[PDB]
Structure formats: structure tokens, C-alpha cells
Amino acid sequence: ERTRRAILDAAMLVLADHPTAALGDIAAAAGVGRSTVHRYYPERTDLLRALARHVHDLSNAAIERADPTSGPVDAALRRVVESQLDLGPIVLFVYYEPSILADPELAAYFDIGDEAIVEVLNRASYPPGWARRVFWALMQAGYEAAKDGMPRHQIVDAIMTSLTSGIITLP
């Protein structure tokens, strides 16, 4: 379990910045040899799908830790947003690398975990499930802004304002 964790953390750290990195680069960052990675993940796709699952699990833990239904909605959503942003740009990688969510099993797993965020967005309230889509869309813009080196506070403010007001105001 420790070695598996070292490998997946190294994959997160490395692929977030260098999405085409060799398995050698990932092994080195984990403090292990290539054969080690191979023993757990025979093919790159194996590693990438394990990585995705691990990232989703960390995302779900951060949601539970943020405790979205506890206390005032504004402060609660900010806790959620801050801790999702702390995952970093690996999230963009996992959602956009074509071979990852192409697996139907993993795609189904990915649909599970954000029910409490949806509750809170519902409480503070559009086609079916649109609000949920918009929230994660704003999160996506947030990850890209973080990628540009924008400070977490300003991203969180931009997301919260976008949730309540959108980005333009029509005459």
C-alpha cells in the first residue's frame, strides 16, 4: 500500500506538469525503479486509470472534510472550492486524457461523491443537473487559473462571484 501510494503520488506530481512524462520520470519521483511501477501497473493505461481513481478518491475525501451542509452556505462553498483547488492541475489531466474516462466502469465511479455539494447548490437555488455542471465548470476554469499561478484567494472569489452573478450583466 505504501509503495502503491508513492507511485500514484509521484504520478500526480509529475503528470500535472509534464503530461507526456516517461514512466521512468514517474518511478524516479516515487523513489522506485521502473520494474516496481511495472509490477503494479503493467501498462501506462493501467497506471493512468489507477491514478484517476486515486485522484477521485482524494477529491471525495476533500468534499467530506469540507462538510458542505455544515454552517452558512457561503463559507461552506468556499471550503469546498479551496480544498478542490488544492488537488491542482492533475484534475485537468484526469478529465482530459482520452484513455482514462474511456473506461465505462471508471466513468461510473467518477459520477459518485458530490451529492452534498449538489444539496447545498439546491438549497441556495434550469435543465436536469445543470447547476451541478456549472459548479464543476467553474472549478475547471479555476484549475486553469491556478495553472497560470493566480493566487487561491482570487480564484475562490471569482468562482463564488460567478456562482451568484455569472460573468456578465445584460442591459
Add this chain to the structure above:
Amino acid sequence: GARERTRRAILDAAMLVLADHPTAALGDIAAAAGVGRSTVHRYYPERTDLLRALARHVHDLSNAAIERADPTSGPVDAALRRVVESQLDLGPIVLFVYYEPSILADPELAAYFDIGDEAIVEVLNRASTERYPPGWARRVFWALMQAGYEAAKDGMPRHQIVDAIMTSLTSGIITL
């Protein structure tokens, strides 16, 4: 000519096939284009070459579509709606190519995507009575567009997606 037509056939086949089968082999795309694997390799020697070409082509379509929407004609709300429609109509292949410069670590493709990418921002800013960090509006627009492509794969009707994107841009989703 023949080569131009063949190139367009391969790209058009890639746009359809990869939107539903993101891991499809180059040979599978060849078959969908009605050409031999041998022929496809004279156009794109490796799959990754086709992926970069497709991404260029889609960015091209995106630019032509914004132009075709006459983004500055008439009431700004109706104009913005035309722009949204124009991009929604590109289809779910946009989900495949959006983050591709990053995915492929291809700064050249990133530079390609840059060209024309301020027009949407001009359209948004000139439809707004107020004044967010650099690039925020652009990124939100495209994130919402992709929520749109996803909703569309999930059976949401075009007109309803356009209404939702428009409402999200101009008013958000919650009240605190």
C-alpha cells in the same frame, strides 16, 4: 482536388469517430473515411499527427463560426446567443481537442489556439454593463460550452442548452 478532398474526409471522419470512441486507432478512422490505412499514413504518419491536425481544424471551425454569427450585429443579447449557438454546433469533438496542447505538451498547438481567442472576450465585454482576473471570462465561457456538449450527449435539447448557457453567463446559479 483529390488530396484536399481526402484530407477533409479523414478529418471529418476523425471528428465523428473520436467524439464517441476517444481511443480509436488511426486505421479505424481510415475505414470511417473510406480510405486505406496505407493512404491515411501518407497524410498523417502517426496517430498523434492526426490529433494535432484535427485540433487545428476544429479551432479553425470555431473561428469561422464566430465570424458567421455576425457577433456585432443588432441587440447584444441576441448576438451573444448566436455566438453560443455557433460554438455549440461544433459538437462534442471540442471536448476531445480543448486541452490537447497541454495533454500533448505541444506549445506550437497552444500558439495556434491563441489566434482569434480574444474575439469571444470582446463579445462578452461588449455585452456587459459591468467589469475578474485575466482570462477568467474566456475560461468560464469555454467551461460552460463544454458543460453544454456534455449535456447534449446526455439528451438535453439544443435550445434548452443554449438557454442554460445564456442564463449561467448572465446570472449564475445560486443566491447567497
